Amino acid sequence: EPDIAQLKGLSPSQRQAYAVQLKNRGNHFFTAKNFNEAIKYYQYAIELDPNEPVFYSNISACYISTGDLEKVIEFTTKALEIKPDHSKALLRRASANESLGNFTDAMFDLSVLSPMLERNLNKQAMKVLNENLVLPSNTSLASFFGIFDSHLEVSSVNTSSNYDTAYALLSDALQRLYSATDEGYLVANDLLTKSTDMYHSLLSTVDDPLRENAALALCYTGIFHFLKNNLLDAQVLLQESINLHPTPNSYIFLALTLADKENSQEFFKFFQKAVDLNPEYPPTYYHRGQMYFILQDYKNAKEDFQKAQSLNPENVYPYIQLACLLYKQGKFTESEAFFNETKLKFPTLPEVPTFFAEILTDRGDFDTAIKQYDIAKRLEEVQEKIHVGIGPLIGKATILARQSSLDEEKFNAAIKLLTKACELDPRSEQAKIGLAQLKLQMEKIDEAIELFEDSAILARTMDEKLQATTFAEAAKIQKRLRA
């Protein structure tokens, strides 16, 4: 109803007087949930004092209330051109941008304004992970394959088939696998996949050596899938392997592939089948004992590990688990004594001081732990195979980075250890993320982002992939604020 032509021709206080009047009329309508009348009066007031950010801010509140998100952005942005720190215009613009799924913009305004930031950060992480949607570390693979009798595994290939044209490739794959070298795992993965493809073609005349060979290629290709976190793929081939020639490895591997934190009964059921197929196979007991260990069933873990130990006394791993059990029972001296007796029998093996270092760390005896890590690394260096990989570098770096609370040597020492670790074992998520956090503490945001991003590619689970991406997306926002 205001004659805004006439009002414009009034003195400067009078025009001011009218914008005030007209704004309040708009506020009346806004309160009466009559948003088109509200907007109309605010636009009237704007014609009389374009300089007042509250008119623009009030108009954007109207559009928040009608759902017009583009209009919220325009009007809050008009408010913020005048006064970049207007709190309601920053709050409203962040909200519209979250609604448009412009999460980084939301996060920027909420940051400038100074749980909502959390929420946009989490939505941004999932958005980038979904847009974005590799064998584990050499360290993890040497650890996985450590319990197996390599000569037994390699010799398990049958040479007596009259049709098997894949078995020499399979034997190569197994030989490479058990070499426990960087090249060894990369070549093993390739050759296993190729062997499986040839066995699938061959299977579709056949003899029992080819069928057993096939069950072996499927079994190990199956476990490679598990290791890469392709759980359906792993189950498919391990089931196929079972169909052709049931073996203890196939059951052990399928049990691991199907492990279920809710209900353990199926796992133990597979393990009984594996036991029946060969009661004298040590990896069956060692693996079952690892599960009892995970379940804190320490009595049963011990008996399984003693059993694996008696069947293969030359493998260091049953000894280690047995010493670790004494420590989890609260018998540290007995644990330490078992480690020492184990070191006497395997004085070249970095496995022993590495796992003992972890118990020392857990007790808060950090200086002894580092000494043990220093020993394991030197022992690792002298071996021809991978035993503990970069585990001693990470063990020592985590302690030094922590201890440096700033202790600037300690911090630099940790950096050089983690950089070394990332170089020697590039597929290690743990070494990258660990470095990324230090880079970020040094304010090396660009380097940190790249590290977090690689770590997300390398991570196995969704949850780990999303943790990594979240760190990277947080850092990109910090980089934008500093930009």
């Binding site: 309160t31 509200a38 509140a61 309601k88």
Partner: peptide
């Protein structure tokens, strides 16, 4: 004062 309010 808060967001659901005009000024």
């Amino acid at each position: 004062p808060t967001v659901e309010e005009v000024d």
